[PDB]
Structure formats: C-alpha cells, structure tokens
Design a protein around this ligand. Sequence first.
Ligand SMILES: C/C(=C\COP(=O)(O)OP(=O)(O)O)CO
Length: 186
Amino acid sequence: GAYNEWKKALFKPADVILDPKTANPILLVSEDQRSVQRAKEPQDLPDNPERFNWHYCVLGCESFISGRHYWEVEVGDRKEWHIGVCSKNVQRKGWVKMTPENGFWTMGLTDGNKYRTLTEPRTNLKLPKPPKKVGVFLDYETGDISFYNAVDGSHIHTFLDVSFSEALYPVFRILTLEPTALTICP
Ligand SMILES: C/C(=C\COP(=O)(O)OP(=O)(O)O)CO
C-alpha cells in the first residue's frame, strides 16, 4: 500500500519506548518498554513529579519540538484504549478533562465499538472496519496530528492546524482490565 511505501518518506519513524516513571501506578510497563497493561490494584510506587497519579496514562520517553514523526500501535481486540499526543506541561496530579485545551490530542475506543475523538465535547467517529493497528502521525510545524489504520491506510481522524507551543509526548491510556495489552510496534 502507499501507506507503507510512503510513511517513512514523509515522516521520521519514532522509536517510542514507554517511560515507567510517568505511568499511573495501576499500569504495568513491559520489560521491552513497548507494551502496557493494567493491574487489579494500584502498585506500590513513588508519587514522583513525572507520574500521572489520576489518569491511567503513560508517556513516551522522548518528546518532539519540531518536525514530522510517526509511530504505530497495535490495539488488537482491546475493547478500550486512547492514544495520541500531549503537551509536556499537562496536569499530571489530580484530574483534568483530557482535551486539546488541556494539552491532549487523543482518540480511541470505549465499550468495544464506540470510537471517539477526545475533544470538548467528545465527538463520535464512524469507522468502516475496526482497526487492529493504528498509526499516529505528527507534523509539528503544520499543526496536524493524524491517525490512520496502519494495515490499510484508511484515515481515522485528524486534528488540524493546532498551534503547538510546548514539546509533545506520545501518550497512551487504558482504563480496563482485559487479556490484550496495548503495544507499540517498532
Ligand atoms: C477515569 C479515567 C478516564 C476517564 O476520563 P473521563 O471520565 O474524563 O472520560 P473520557 O471521555 O473517556 O476521557 C482515567 O484516565
């Protein structure tokens, strides 16, 4: 497909590893630092400044302040997940609604078959086929964050022309306890 043939011509492949210091203590980051799961109960970890202590989130180890970047995430048969980018300076302690105005540009799935963008208010997406693997694409200078079905190239959603002022991290959120993890592809 053109998607596979061109992605690297146009966007720099990000090698995203999950930063265990950022991860909500209810989350487990795998040893290879590419997959996240949820525990039944919050594990015993410090409340260091980088950790999300309320939202069930985890960040990439590296952020972006320019250029064009992409990574792919195997969502598989998970019933719930959200992925995207966020500002370095988001509120990590206590609640904030996950929205562009709070520095989060995400979308995902809930209740097995409801695809949404996490805008204010949420808006529903209509996807012909459920995706298994989702590509997340950032162009910092144009302001676009776009999501594609990584297996067939079809478009899922684009946040257009955001005027970014901070560094941006990949972000991943899982609310549910299910057999299937959320996994980054290298
Ligand atoms: C409790 C929780 C997430 C749910 O947040 P919200 O209740 O704000 O809902 P959503 O529209 O899915 O963001 C932990 O990240």
